[PDB]
Design a protein around this ligand. Structure first.
Ligand code: FES
Ligand code: FES
Ligand SMILES: [K+]
Ligand SMILES: [K+]
Lengths: 128, 126
């Protein structure tokens, strides 16, 4: 089976070009080529995190396998979910993906300006 | 067996009992507490779904957070200064009758899905 080219736009805004085998997941591509993306693929592709979140080009997105309920559950928890988002670890390379660009979106940690004040209730100590 | 109170996302209190040494994920799971989606990664420090909020005094004396826990706790939605990952917090006799809260998920917070863009341009400057 042949190899194809995939471009990644990093959170940094830097473009990484790499080559992946047809049939490999985009997570596999990130890992097997040791790309500079921090935090990506925490659950190691077992549909238990949202860290493999990627954004796809219009015409690639349109052609992706229908999203399973399982994926959708975890995709709902992706930070900054878009109408071109999928979990990269469920998306397998096809020949028609050659020279596509996917973007790695920012995490909740990148956007967070402050840590909230934690609280178990609004209840006044006097009452409690 | 010690008693823990969970304040659910609905605002409702669930009271349940856990063995010493069990994690709070353990407790949630073993007693089938209706908490949607809590502990996806089954306690392998690979999600943020076991996020819980603790009382001041309990929080302070919890086991020192590890880097592994902290990397994932950074990815929790609505991180608080009283937040930890429940799958890493084990019951002690001293925790009997404490209260924790389950914070809302990003999906609960969400009012709409955004427009996806691989990238932007301001061709006003071509
Ligand atoms: S790696 Fe965890 S869901 Fe894709
Ligand atoms: S259960 Fe996934 S990290 Fe706690
Ligand atoms: K905040
Ligand atoms: K939105």
């Amino acid at each position: 089976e042949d190899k194809i080219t995939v471009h990644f736009i990093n959170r940094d805004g830097e473009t990484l070009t790499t080559k992946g085998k047809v049939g490999d997941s985009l997570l596999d591509v990130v890992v097997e080529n040791n790309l500079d993306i921090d935090g990506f693929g925490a659950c190691e592709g077992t549909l238990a995190c949202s860290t493999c979140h990627l954004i796809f080009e219009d015409h690639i997105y349109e052609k992706l396998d229908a999203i399973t309920d399982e994926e959708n559950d975890m995709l709902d928890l992706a930070y900054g979910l878009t109408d071109r988002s999928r979990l990269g670890c469920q998306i397998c390379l096809t020949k028609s993906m050659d020279n596509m660009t996917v973007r790695v979106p920012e995490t909740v940690a990148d956007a967070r300006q402050s840590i909230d004040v934690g609280k178990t209730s609004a209840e006044n100590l006097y009452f409690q």
